[PDB]
């Protein structure tokens, strides 16, 4: 009944959010290396990173609970 598929689908969705966070962080790092005169964009990237990270932690915690349930 797609027990494994459901977990994998959820994990792939989580990986997409994680890659979104990594892309946001990469823009922040690339901008920082160039010593920008203004920090408005970098501050916004940090704020978005915090939001995405919070959701990633909630989803990951849920997936971990499901992974432990299935393995028993």
């Amino acid at each position: 009944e797609y027990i494994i598929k459901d977990i994998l689908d959820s994990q792939e969705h989580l990986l997409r959010l994680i890659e979104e966070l990594l892309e946001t962080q990469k823009e922040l790092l690339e901008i920082l290396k160039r010593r920008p005169d203004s920090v408005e964009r970098v501050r916004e990237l940090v704020r978005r990173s915090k939001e995405i990270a919070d959701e990633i932690r909630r989803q990951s915690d849920r997936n971990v609970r499901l992974l432990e349930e299935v393995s028993k």
Partner: protein
């Protein structure tokens, strides 16, 4: 049980990936603070790059783990 070891390993990798990501978000904010006071020393940037490199590597292993799980559920 072969899938049980993989499922628990996948949980281990996922938690590790989240902790690292949380660390990167915190460290990157601190670098922004360093830039605001004009004290960047290059090493802080290197630390962020190293963290990105490690994160990319962790994501690749997670995908490999999914492949092992799929290969074992056919």
């Amino acid at each position: 049980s072969p899938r049980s070891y993989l499922l628990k390993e996948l949980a281990d990798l996922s938690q590790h990936l989240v902790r690292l990501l949380e660390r990167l978000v915190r460290e990157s904010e601190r670098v922004v603070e360093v830039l605001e006071r004009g004290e960047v020393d290059e090493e802080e940037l290197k630390r962020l790059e190293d963290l990105h490199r490690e994160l990319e590597k962790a994501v690749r292993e997670v995908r490999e783990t999914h492949r092992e799980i799929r290969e074992r559920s056919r």
